[PDB]
Write an enzyme that holds these catalytic residues in place. Structure first.
Site, PDB file in Angstrom:
ATOM      1  CB  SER E 117      -3.243-105.275 -94.074  1.00  0.00           C
ATOM      2  OG  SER E 117      -4.414-106.062 -94.041  1.00  0.00           O
ATOM      3  NE  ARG E 118      -3.286-103.471 -86.400  1.00  0.00           N
ATOM      4  CZ  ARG E 118      -3.737-102.816 -85.336  1.00  0.00           C
ATOM      5  NH1 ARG E 118      -4.132-103.480 -84.262  1.00  0.00           N
ATOM      6  NH2 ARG E 118      -3.791-101.494 -85.348  1.00  0.00           N
ATOM      7  CB  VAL E 119      -5.280-110.512 -92.061  1.00  0.00           C
ATOM      8  CG1 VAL E 119      -6.235-110.129 -90.934  1.00  0.00           C
ATOM      9  CG2 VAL E 119      -5.632-109.837 -93.365  1.00  0.00           C
TER      10      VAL E 119
END
Ligand SMILES: Nc1ncnc2c1ncn2[C@@H]1O[C@H](COP(=O)(O)OP(=O)(O)OP(=O)(O)O)[C@@H](O)[C@H]1O
Ligand SMILES: Nc1ncnc2c1ncn2[C@@H]1O[C@H](COP(=O)(O)OP(=O)(O)OP(=O)(O)O)[C@@H](O)[C@H]1O
Ligand SMILES: Nc1ncnc2c1ncn2[C@@H]1O[C@H](COP(=O)(O)OP(=O)(O)O)[C@@H](O)[C@H]1O
Ligand SMILES: [Mg+2]
Ligand SMILES: [Mg+2]
Ligand SMILES: [Mg+2]
Lengths: 53, 469, 501, 486, 128
Positions: E117-119
């Site tokens: 998950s790139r946040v």
């Protein structure tokens, strides 16, 4: 040593057979993908020739 | 009649007529050209238009140019005067020695012999090549194919066959070169002149070359096969004599049709080939036949695009041959030359009745031992070869010996190998393979058989290796 | 069925009888320009494949002669042509200038100078689309073209008049082979043996101009530009220019061929001429074929490569060698265009991209590289040494995936394979090549270390060039290695070996 | 001018005339060109008609006049064809005179429904052990012969045709089988040598060779199978039994594809039109076995297919594999290692099964099938051979003998009783004590011996159609006695 | 609507591999030139324009938000097919659901090796 060697060969060839099968799984998936891609590509070429004329 | 050009697209020219219309396959001469341009009619589009394929480059054509209908298909000179000459697709000479002055002209389009005219005899034609004679014997009057990839030995092999048979032939010969290198055409011409087969001074030539090399626009590469075939037809019928007909290549006859097809307004077939591939090839390969009134021993080299024997072109040709010798790249990589694949070359006279019981038994023994070796190689891949049983190490050793013994040095390959070309009559081949199978040579190294003629020469070579050891 | 010229702007002219006022024989009006292809109404007297000239200085080449319009292709960017522009013939099939004036100029596909050194002062012009020699003019390839690359000159000899093919994956060193070949001929061209001068042509097709500029700088550095032409149809240039560049170069070479001189021409790449041709055909609405390539993309290259010939002495004795460069994708040499060209040429140099990492540079994959001309086009000394060297490598290549005899065989094979490596832009005279090959193939390196042959080669070459130039001159002039020359070489090799350690 | 019963060619080229007029022409009707050329009207379009020319379009100008013959394509039939060589329309091409057949039939008739048929129950003897025992073929079946190049398919067909001579020379009438051999897209010299071969075995007095060779226009190769199938339906619908061999059915598909692509119909997969299933299904569905209310006749079919590189997932191979009641694979790997006929018995099948085997061959092949099934799953060990227990050792020592029994030679089919005798000797166990290489010799000897002395036992097996325990004991005695003195 | 009126929404497309098939039907019936796997070249813009609306408006724009959870379905678990990669390059993360972890009874079958998950760590409760 003879008993140990034969047990080791049994285990080694079992592991090699399992590795070969686990490789054939991926190779079969890739082969089916490529076969469908070839069919689609040839078909698109035929119909693009047909439309162009 | 007289029409006028109306459209030029690539090698496809449309011509509009106001007098009667020229039937299909007619030849129309374009007026106002420095060199003869001939358009062969190929379609009637309606409105007194005909679509045609130019036999020569359409550079510098102008809409509205005038075109005269010759009135008959491409007619070419024939007779015993074309011997020793060189001809275009349209038959006019290209060896710069003046016109071919004949009495006979022939139209390159003509129906094939009817079913009631075929011959049914078959007699082996000894060629002097161990593999070809042993596993896939040729036949007098039969059609023969050499299926090769690129650079495997088709041309060297066909030159060897020319050298061997055409020189020792009572009858005439013809070499139609369809769309292959011009370097090779010149090489062959000079080889024949220097070997006496062609003769410039007097009338003693036995070869009638015809050339449509790969610089000719597709309309020409697709027809020169018919021109050479017409010359051979004449020699078969009118002379009432035996004939040879080497064609190299017969793939280009299909490739050229494919090239022109799209512009003719045809939907493309499976692999980009014209929809009419099978019939456009049957109407040609059905004229190359022995009949009750003659005999043609046709040999044809066949490109196999990318070594793919399942390609539509070779796949379709396979059905038109009485004998195929599938040259292979894998064997040629092992250095075995000729590269002929023993387990893919077949024949129709390989029967115990036509070639004899012993020849048949030996050929099948060779094939079976090679196939067993192929199966064993899979095991040898893993176990190593010291683990093989003692009935199989013998099989592998014998199979390697047979592989080597199938190789042979040709007289036209002295430039490459340096060795001296050999001819191995049938008896030596059968005897040598009988002996190699029986085990009478388990004591010689396998390399003793590499590139030798009869078996006795393998024995002598083994002795020389031992001595120099 | 709607004709292209069945528009209102034209039918209106026809209806009100005003068409007679304009010239529709040697002139035409652009019906529709788009994507680099113009349709032109008029030009009833325009020849097929003739050049035409638009009303803004741009040129075009009338390819399609349809019943009512003409499909013209612009040798430029169609940003300046507008529907209704006047197209006027030029009268002549598209032709390019030729001569010795081009030598040393970065000319462009149509013969215009893009090096900025002034106009080409050429005199004669040749049609790009001319027929190749026949069966009679040619003779068998006999002279050697010295590539200057040990591996090529040793195991893949190339004669003068022979069409090789440098085929390999991207970034494996094909252009490097080409430029080694161009630079090598410097020694012959700076001489008096007028029968050995070779004039080079480099056709750069669909390559960024930075590449061509660096290449021209490299050639000027070795002062290999006084005898080189560079026909540059780079990527930014319209598709028709990239499609015509090979023919412009080939005609510039047919000039030198038709005048008893020897030329070399290097198309790089041909797989991009094929792409330009496909773009052109698809934009003229011609039906596609395999991979959308037009139906006749074989004839496109066959009619180009067939012009590389070797004329007999009744036709001047000239020569035109061709070195097409193809780019395979993933070693897939069995693609469509690579397969088209592999059967048109006679010979082929296989640059493998894993020989290129395993250490071997140049990556030439011997065993798969062939030269159908073969030893017939080699020097006698090189014949002598290569006869043994090729055989020894052929044996070592089947026992490479590993006794005493076979261990010696493997050692010798590795020694040779380290003797075939080489740098860049540093070709070697044939005499030096034969010297080092003889040093390595007799056995005078069967003990030295593998990692030290790379430097022993250079040291031995410097020693011979600095001490025994008389021997090299004798070998080169005599052509063959004489017995006294063989003994001199034996002495020199043993002496240098002993005092090298 | 008439534009209802007559029309005029607008265009021609590549064998597809475009005619204008012929407003009353029916679809798939036979029109005639002014040049003595026939043609079949396939495309009926609002503005024109697409005629496929049965011959060369060199003779079809533009503006020619085409007149409709008023009839759908039809072919002669009857026992007047037997022994002749006809082309795709009934014209003789053997030059023995006219054909002289009273009747006619339409090539494009429909197959029998669901009620007329009855389950396939009689055995169609092919005279090949590997087929007659392991992949049997009944009467009314459709048994595809699918293989690669030069693997022996045409030879299977010709052995089948030659075998029926023993039945056709007898007096039993419900065992007579009449053969038809449709040869599609084949070199004429191949068909000539084949006709000579059939004459040699005297099997050409009940055979009809329909010839649509390579030179013939595409419509003739498209139409030959239907001509043959009609000449066979004639025998089916008259209480007689027929056997039609299409060779190949892939070249009919190629010819049909050519016509379609030239008529500009939407290409489809591999450029095959959308009808290459309908085309073959409405042909192979005419092989039936009528019940007694309809005569009791039957019509077997043995379509031959060539597969490129053993690829049986291609378009036409799968189209014809999903239509038929079995398939006989012929692999080349087995061909070259001695197994000839190279009938891969793993992939071969017959959905009819043992419902179409004589009770004797059922009795024996029932266990032979299982023995080979067991052998095929320990075949790999054969190389190692030793280092394994006596169980698998005996398995693959029985399998090798059984395999070497199934080898057979050109044009020498065996009577069912002799196949039963040989397989009985082999499987009951009277050969496991014999070196495999000699097995064939034993066979070729034992066979002859039994043929000479014990003809009465073979007659009893043939007539009773079963191995009665009396006959079983006598056969065991014969085998034991012979094997003793070998 | 919620996102632009200060509220928070969550939209689950299930599946987006069966919208691209409907779009391929829609296109091939318009005669548009098929591309890779017969999909039109537009089959990216189709998903990019749809998934670029799952934004998070700042406080000067209401402060709402619209999470999106596209559900793709991969034949034989080929993550490198055309549509799976078209969408893997449009989204901010991914949750791979193995079919052999699932068959082992390990459910839900998230393949934590490949999932990302790139946040990620941002917008996670400190305790967790
Ligand atoms: N003999 C050699 N020794 C060391 N490096 C080499 C050699 N030959 C080529 N190279 C290296 O290979 C790289 C690419 O070479 P080159 O551009 O000539 O090949 P190419 O395939 O034509 O490239 P491209 O195809 O991308 O134009 C260069 O960086 C060069 O340094
Ligand atoms: N039962 C058999 N025993 C020995 N040889 C056989 C047998 N069957 C076929 N052959 C051999 O196989 C070769 C090819 O036979 P056949 O013509 O039957 O194959 P085919 O598939 O019909 O060939 P094609 O595909 O070219 O038509 C022949 O030369 C023949 O001798
Ligand atoms: N009998 C042979 N002996 C040695 N080398 C051969 C032989 N046949 C072919 N070769 C090699 O293989 C190459 C193949 O070329 P060739 O057969 O002439 O063209 P093609 O590609 O049509 O087969 C030859 O140039 C030669 O180097
Ligand atoms: Mg060749
Ligand atoms: Mg480069
Ligand atoms: Mg056959």
């Amino acid at each position: 040593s003879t008993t140990s060697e034969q047990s080791a060969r049994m285990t080694a060839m079992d592991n090699a057979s399992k590795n070969a099968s686990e490789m054939i799984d991926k190779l079969t998936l890739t082969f089916n993908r490529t076969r469908q891609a070839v069919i689609t590509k040839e078909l698109i070429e035929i119909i693009s020739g047909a439309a162009a004329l | 009649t007289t029409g006028r050009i109306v459209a030029v697209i690539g090698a496809v020219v449309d011509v509009q007529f106001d007098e009667g219309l020229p039937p299909i396959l007619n030849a129309l001469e374009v007026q106002g050209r420095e060199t003869r341009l001939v358009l062969e009619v190929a379609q009637h589009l309606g409105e007194s238009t005909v679509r045609t394929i130019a036999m020569d480059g359409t550079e510098g054509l102008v809409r509205g140019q005038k075109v005269l209908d010759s009135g008959a298909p491409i007619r070419i000179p024939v007779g015993p005067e074309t011997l020793g000459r060189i001809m275009n697709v349209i038959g006019e000479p290209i060896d710069e020695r003046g016109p071919i002055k004949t009495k006979q002209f022939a139209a390159i389009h003509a129906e094939a012999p009817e079913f009631v005219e075929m011959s049914v005899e078959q007699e082996i034609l000894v060629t002097g090549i161990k593999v070809v004679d042993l596993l896939a014997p040729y036949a007098k009057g039969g059609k023969i194919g050499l299926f090769g990839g690129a650079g495997v030995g088709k041309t060297v092999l066909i030159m060897e066959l020319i050298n061997n048979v055409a020189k020792a032939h009572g009858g005439y010969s013809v070499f139609a070169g369809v769309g292959e290198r011009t370097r090779e055409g010149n090489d062959l011409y000079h080889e024949m002149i220097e070997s006496g087969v062609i003769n410039l001074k007097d009338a003693t030539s036995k070869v009638a070359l015809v050339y449509g090399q790969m610089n000719e626009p597709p309309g020409a590469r697709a027809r020169v096969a018919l021109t050479g075939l017409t010359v051979a037809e004449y020699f078969r019928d009118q002379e009432g004599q035996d004939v040879l007909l080497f064609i190299d290549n017969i793939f280009r006859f299909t490739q050229a049709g494919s090239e022109v097809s799209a512009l003719l307004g045809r939907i493309p077939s499976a692999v980009g080939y014209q929809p009419t591939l099978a019939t456009d090839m049957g109407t040609m390969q059905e004229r190359i036949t022995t009949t009750k009134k003659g005999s043609i021993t046709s040999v044809q080299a066949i490109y196999v695009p990318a070594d793919d024997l399942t390609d539509p072109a070779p796949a379709t040709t396979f059905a038109h041959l009485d004998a195929t010798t599938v040259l292979s790249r894998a064997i040629a990589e092992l250095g075995i030359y000729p590269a002929v694949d023993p387990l893919d070359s077949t024949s129709r006279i390989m029967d115990p009745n036509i070639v004899g019981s012993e020849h048949y038994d030996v050929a099948r023994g060779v094939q079976k031992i090679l196939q067993d070796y192929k199966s064993l190689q899979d095991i040898i891949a893993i176990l190593g070869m010291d683990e093989l049983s003692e009935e199989d190490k013998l099989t592998v050793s014998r199979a390697r010996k047979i592989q080597r013994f199938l190789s042979q040095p040709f007289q036209v390959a002295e430039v490459f190998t340096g060795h001296l070309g050999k001819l191995v009559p049938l008896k030596e081949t059968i005897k040598g393979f009988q002996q190699i199978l029986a085990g009478e040579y388990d004591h010689l190294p396998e390399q003793a058989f590499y590139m030798v003629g009869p078996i006795e020469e393998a024995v002598a070579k083994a002795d020389k290796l031992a001595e120099e050891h | 069925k709607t004709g292209t010229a069945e528009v209102s702007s034209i039918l209106e002219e026809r209806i009100l009888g005003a068409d007679t006022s304009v010239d529709l024989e040697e002139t035409g009006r652009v019906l529709s320009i788009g994507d680099g292809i113009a349709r032109v109404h008029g030009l009833r007297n325009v020849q097929a494949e003739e050049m035409v000239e638009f009303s803004s200085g741009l040129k075009g080449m009338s390819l399609n002669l349809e019943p009512d319009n003409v499909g013209v292709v612009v040798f430029g960017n169609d940003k300046l042509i507008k529907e209704g522009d006047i197209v006027k013939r030029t009268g002549a099939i598209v032709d390019v200038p030729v001569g010795e004036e081009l030598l040393g100029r970065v000319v462009d596909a149509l013969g215009n100078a893009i090096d900025g050194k002034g106009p080409i002062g050429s005199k004669a012009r040749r049609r790009v689309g001319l027929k190749a020699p026949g069966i009679i003019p040619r003779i068998s390839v006999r002279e050697p073209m010295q590539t200057g690359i040990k591996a090529v000159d040793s195991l893949v000899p190339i004669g003068r008049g022979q069409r090789e093919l440098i085929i390999g994956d991207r970034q494996t060193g094909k252009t490097s082979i080409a430029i080694d070949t161009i630079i090598n001929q410097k020694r012959f061209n700076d001489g008096t043996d007028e029968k050995k001068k070779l004039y080079c042509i480099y056709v750069a097709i669909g390559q960024k101009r930075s590449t061509v500029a660096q290449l021209v700088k490299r050639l000027t550095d070795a002062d290999a530009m006084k005898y080189t032409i560079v026909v540059s149809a780079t990527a930014s240039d319209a598709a028709p220019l990239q499609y015509l560049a090979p023919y412009s170069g080939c005609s510039m070479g047919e000039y030198f061929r038709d005048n008893g001189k020897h030329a070399l021409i290097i198309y790089d790449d041909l797989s991009k001429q094929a792409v330009a041709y496909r773009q052109m055909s698809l934009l003229l609405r011609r039906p596609p074929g395999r991979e959308a390539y037009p139906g006749d993309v074989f004839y496109l290259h066959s009619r180009l490569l067939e012009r590389a010939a070797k004329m007999n002495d009744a036709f001047g004795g000239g020569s035109l060698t061709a070195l097409p460069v193809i780019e395979t994708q993933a070693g897939d040499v069995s693609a469509y265009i690579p397969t088209n060209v592999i059967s048109i040429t006679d010979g082929q140099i296989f640059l493998e991209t894993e020989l290129f990492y395993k250490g071997i540079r140049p990556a030439i994959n011997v065993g798969l590289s062939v030269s159908r001309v073969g030893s017939a086009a080699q020097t006698r000394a090189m014949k002598q040494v290569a006869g043994t060297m090729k055989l020894e490598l052929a044996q070592y290549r089947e026992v490479a995936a590993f006794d005493a005899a076979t261990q010696q065989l493997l050692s010798r094979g590795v020694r040779l394979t380290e003797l075939l490596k080489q740098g860049q832009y540093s070709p070697m005279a044939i005499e030096e090549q034969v010297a080092v090959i003889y040093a390595g193939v007799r056995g005078y390196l069967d003990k030295l270390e593998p990692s030290k042959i790379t430097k022993f080669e250079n040291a031995f070459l410097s020693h011979v060039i600095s001490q025994h130039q008389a021997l090299l001159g004798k070998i080169r002039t005599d052509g063959k290695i004489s017995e006294e020359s063989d003994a001199k070489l034996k002495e020199i090799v043993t002496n240098f070996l002993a005092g090298f350690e």
